[PDB]
């Protein structure tokens, strides 16, 4: 019998291909799930995770901290246009808001 | 392709008088006469589209109207007409004949 080698290592991913396949099969999405569908979906999930993790780690470095907290995820999502569009209807707990003051409210000389 | 009712005017029945006079004099015929009349139709159409400028209105009391074959006809009694391009003329009776501007 061959040595067990996980599907995520075959696809070169960190996200679980097998767990995504099981969640697709039990999720009642279709009566059949293709072989490459969990691979592709796990790759897409890994890419989106990596994008938010670039932006949140950069937000944490800019705040001079080494841990990503909800504020860093909030800043990461809102300062990027496409992740803000993807999470437009999404609120992040303990994330706060973007620092934004309307220019007419600024004092005048 | 235009409306053929302008020989009922003075200029038109004088042309038909001229053409059938020359027919009776024995050099022209019906084909020449009819081509004269449609050419007359085109040139009266163009001269009334371009080189008219006066303003003429008549107000009166109507006697008999009518509308058939794309032609409105009216009879107006005791009507007052005025001329401006300042003369007002009183005329007891006048008849109005017209056809639609856009030929079909």
């Amino acid at each position: 019998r061959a040595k067990a080698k996980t599907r995520s290592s075959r696809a070169g991913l960190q996200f679980p291909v097998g767990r995504v396949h099981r969640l697709l099969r039990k999720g009642n999405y279709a009566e059949r799930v293709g072989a490459g569908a969990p691979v592709y979906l796990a790759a897409v999930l890994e890419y989106l995770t990596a994008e938010i993790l670039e932006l949140a780690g950069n937000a944490a470095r800019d705040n001079k901290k080494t841990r990503i907290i909800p504020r860093h995820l909030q800043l990461a999502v809102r300062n990027d246009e496409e992740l803000n569009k993807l999470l437009g209807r999404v609120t992040i707990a303990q994330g706060g808001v973007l620092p934004n003051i309307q220019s007419v409210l600024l004092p005048k000389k | 392709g235009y409306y053929e009712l302008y020989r009922r005017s003075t200029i038109g029945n004088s042309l038909v008088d001229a053409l059938d006079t020359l027919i009776s004099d024995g050099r022209i015929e019906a084909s020449l006469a009819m081509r004269v009349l449609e050419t007359f139709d085109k040139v009266v159409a163009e001269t009334l589209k371009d080189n008219t400028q006066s303003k003429l209105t008549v107000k009166g009391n109507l006697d008999t109207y009518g509308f058939c074959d794309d032609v409105w006809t009216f009879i107006v009694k005791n009507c007052q007409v005025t001329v401006e391009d300042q003369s007002v003329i009183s005329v007891d009776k006048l008849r109005i004949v017209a056809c639609n501007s856009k030929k079909s």
Partner: protein, 98 residues
């Protein structure tokens, strides 16, 4: 005379402070009690997980802050700085909540 800031300087300082921070701006026990009296109208003798009331407070505060952003923008559209309730009606009406 004691030092007194001009009207609007402390307001801007508070705007910067509360936009820099992330904590809940409503006291937790009054919000707790408000959630419970609203929940009495749908089912008597209810209980709440603490995380449930915290989720409700996060959602309510985010909703109110976004509503106040739209309220501020539609007040500014009226060439104003103070927000009156007609601003809140305009924001909720354009947002399809009325």
């Amino acid at each position: 005379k004691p030092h007194r800031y001009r009207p609007g300087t402390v307001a801007l300082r508070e705007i910067r402070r509360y936009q820099k921070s992330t904590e809940l701006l409503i006291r937790k026990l009054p919000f707790q009690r408000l959630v419970r009296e609203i929940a009495q109208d749908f089912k008597t003798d209810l209980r709440f997980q603490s995380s449930a009331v915290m989720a409700l407070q996060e959602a309510s505060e985010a909703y109110l802050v976004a509503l106040f952003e739209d309220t501020n923008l539609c007040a500014i559209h009226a060439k104003r700085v103070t927000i009156m309730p007609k601003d809140i009606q305009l924001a909720r009406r354009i947002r399809g909540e009325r």
